[model samples]
Target: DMDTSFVGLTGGQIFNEMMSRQNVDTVFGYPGGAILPVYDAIHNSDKFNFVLPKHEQGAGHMAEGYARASGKPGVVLVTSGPGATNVVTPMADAFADGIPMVVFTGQVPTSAIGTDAFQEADVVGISRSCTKWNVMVKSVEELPLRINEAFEIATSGRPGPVLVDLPKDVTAAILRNPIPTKTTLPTSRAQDEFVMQSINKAADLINLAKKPVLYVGAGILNHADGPRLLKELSDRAQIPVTTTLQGLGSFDQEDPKSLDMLGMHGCATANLAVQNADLIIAVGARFDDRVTGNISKFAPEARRAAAEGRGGIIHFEVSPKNINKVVQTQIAVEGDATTNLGKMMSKIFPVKERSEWFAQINKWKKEYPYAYMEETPGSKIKPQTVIKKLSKVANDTGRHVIVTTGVGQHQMWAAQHWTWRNPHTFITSGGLGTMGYGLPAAIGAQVAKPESLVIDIDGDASFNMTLTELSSAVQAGTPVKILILNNEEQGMVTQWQSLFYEHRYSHTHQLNPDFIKLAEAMGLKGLRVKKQEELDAKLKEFVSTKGPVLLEVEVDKKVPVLPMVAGGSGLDEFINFDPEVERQQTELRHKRTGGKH
Candidate 1:
């Protein structure tokens, strides 16, 4: 119902009211000259609390963290030009990974637009490449509808960021009549008859295949019904599932039929199983290069000649655009993941379990498991052990804890080691690989889950990129914890350089400021752990701390993440944790890169 009695409200107030009606109570952004009027509106009202991040990128990632944690549309408010440009990375991140967000960028007056106006940039134009949809509000009356529409678009099909550029004049102008509470945009995807036929065909394949693998991704996390639907299908059919990095918690990781994650750093068994499967049921997962390794060789067995025409590939996705966009699909089931999966679920026929395929997968799992040697006599701190212990502490506390990470070896290690028992708990820069994402994401997670423990597991190099947010966390009173695995190098880059660059270290080595003092200076507690003996106690204390705490664990710089498939190679080709095999591969790459063998 429209509250038509209210009149003469500024666009800023109207937009604020719209957000309040939509249940937005928190926002993350930085203020600027063009955004001052909206900021003034925020100050005048008690409807929302905004976090002022030190940098615009921090604001974007913090919003991402908040959205990824809460499953709600993350809101970002920033000014035009540089502020808008600074957020492009996170916008692209959200776009690629399917995170829901609404970004409001303040612009110059409509009259000044495209006139080389001060503090103005064509944000709508710049953001088009990165966002799902975007618009520039030229009229004050359109601002309210545009704001509501942006939220709808962001939270709709395949979920991505939507931008609304608010010109300064429009924000300041008056508007009459109350803003509507509902979106005018169509919010649901139609499940037509053709879609149903494809889904039924997919069900037929699932029931008949001797070996089938479910490759899942972040799309399954969009709806609460997603987890339930996936579980029902997989469990009923006795099918094994492997998840992409973004889909970690969509399925229960502890399930025996689950492969924690499958990609470049994925488990050996998971990769091999995908390689050998006769049927590949791709749900929500895009055929990412990381997951595919060599597209030509991916699921070659599935493509083999059979009585059933090429073995079979059934892909389920919400967005029609994503269908057959990557790998070709024999059957394309399009609609909402939860809905499409449910439709397929109803058509699923009774199936007999093939013990042979299950036995083969079990053999692979037992033979080539994710492995690391336990810490023993006179060993430098192992990053893997640090993560395991941290996971242990979180589990023991019985407290709901959300984990975020910056991209690097630590990110992969955390993904590999931690038991993600719930959705929206494990957040990271999956597609973009943003270095500075951890700290601010943790801050946003803390904001979203105030009663829950939020932790950022970061590498030394990645941590330094947005370490400035520690002060903001202090001021916001968000008790997020940071665990820095101090390897004194850009660990992932160093690993790659070591393997592929003739052992010539580039700018991988980094000298860092004393992080303990740095954290203390930011008005937060900090601790350092050099010896392995003190690791458990320090980690427990750090997690138990009531406020923000930074714990730095000095770790060995030379270790590499194992079960790695060299780029452009098949999934079957992987370099496990063998020093001799790694050296041989390194020498082979050295010769290829014009180094003396």
Candidate 2:
């Protein structure tokens, strides 16, 4: 119902009122000249608490972290021009990963727009490439509805960011009309007759296939019932499950049916399982290049079988635009993952247990594993070893640990080493590969889940990028832990240069700040480990501290991330691997599990 008593309210006041109604209490951004009106309303109204970050970009990423952790739209408020421009990267990041976020940018007056007014940017136009939807308010009457519309667009469908641009005059203008409580939103994708037919065929195929793999991604995490539905389908039909990086925590990796992660820098057994499966059931996962290193070769036998009217790919997605955009699907079931997958839940789709196929996957899992060289007493700390220890400590605490990471070797190592069991616990910049994402994201996660342990696993180069967010964390009182793996280089870039570019380093080498002192200056404790012997003991002290602490450990620079498939090669082709050496280490791992998995 419209609030009849809302007469004589300004557009800025209405914005606050709508946010209060929407249950948005935390916002991340910076204020400026054109945004003064909105900030003015914020001062008088105690409806929101804002977290000021070091840069506008940090604000955007913090919002992303908050959304990814809390499953709500992360809100951002910033001025026009550079402030709007600064958030484009994070907005693009959120869009690529399908995170829900809403950004409000203040603009110059409507009369001054396109007239060389200061702080003016074509926000709606500039954000078109990134945002799910964008709008610029022309009058105070449109402001409340636009805010409602932005939230709907950002959260519905395949969730993504939306932008609302408000001109200063529109915000400052008086509004005598009653405030609107709701805005019209589009109807969701219909589960029509054709959709049911495709879904039925997909169900039949899964029940009939001898070898099947469920390749899942972040889209599975979009629905509240996503993880449970996926488990239901996989267990009922006996399909093996493999997840993308963004979909890490949605499934229990400890289970025998689970393939930890499959892509570049992913598990070997997972990558191989995808190639050999006769039926590839893609749920919420786009056919990304990393997963499909060589498009011509991905799921080769399965694709061939599909051509002959047999086993093939069944792709489930909410967005029609994603269907057949990459790998062609034999059956395209387009609708909400929960709704469409529910259609297959009936016992009519009976289980077909392919014992032989399951046996083959178990064999592969035994022979191949994610392995690293063991650290010796006198050796420098290996980053992988450090991550393995951190994982152990996290488990020992018996606390739900949330990990955030910056892009590089450390991120990959953290993903590879951690025992991921819960959804939304492993948050990283998978789509955009944004460096410096970990600290702010950790802060945001701490903000979202104050009871859990939120840690930022970072690389030296990535940490230095937005290290100033340390102050934001201190001020916000989130007590997020920070761990920097100091490799003295951009580890991934250095690895690439070493592998493909003939060691042409090309500015990848980095000089890092003394993180211990930096943490001290930023109002937190700092610790450093120079020797391998000191690592475990130092780590104990670091984690035992209740407040925030920066722990920097120097590691070897030349170690390259393995399970590597060259960009254009088949997933089976690993670069620079001595199969005998890897198998020697990998076999030991599965041998401990009695060859069951």
Per-residue alpha-carbon lDDT of candidate 1 for residues 100-134, written as tens digits (9 for 90 to 100): 98999999988998799998898899889899999
Error of 2 at 369 (Å): 1.0
Candidate 1 lDDT at 489 equals 86
lDDT (0 to 1) per candidate? 0.85, 0.85
Model 1 stretches with alpha carbons more than 4 Å out: 1-6, 176-191, 305-307, 350-352, 373-376, 579-597
Global local distance difference test of model 1: 0.85
RMSD of every prediction: 3.1, 5.7
Per-residue accuracy of model 2 over 106-194 as CA lDDT, tens digit each: 99999999998887889899999999999999888778778888898899889999999989998898886765545411132453877
